[PDB]
């Protein structure tokens, strides 16, 4: 009965998030902003 | 012997492979998914992330 939030990535979302860490724009791939 | 959810060939120990944890639970070649080496690296290193194949994400 411990519960946790896990973010599911599509391939597109993953490739995008990776490009964003490469270009220094975000910390990690789960660093979602608004 | 695991068929690649996309291309349907075997997924050997010497390849890049990823598991859909969205639902269908199939293994896929990283190449077949279109996922870059960098995305693979980062996603598997990331504690609170999982991957989902494209059919699984559509629904
Ligand atoms: Zn394949
Ligand atoms: Zn799936």
Numbering used by the authors:
A (entry chain B): 172 to 205
B (entry chain A): 340 to 398
Please quote the authors directly:
Molecularly, BCL9/Lgs proteins function as adaptors between Pygo and Armadillo/β-catenin, by binding through their homology domain 1 (HD1) to the PHD finger in the C terminus of Pygo, and through their homology domain 2 (HD2) to the Armadillo repeat domain of Armadillo/β-catenin (Kramps et al., 2002; Städeli and Basler, 2005). Therefore, this is a prime example of histone tail binding by a PHD finger (of Pygo) being modulated by a cofactor (BCL9/Legless).
In one of our PHD-HD1 crystals (space group C2221, WT2), where two binary complexes are seen in the asymmetric unit, one of the N-terminal hPHD ends was inserted into the peptide-binding pocket of the second complex, thus behaving as a pseudoligand.
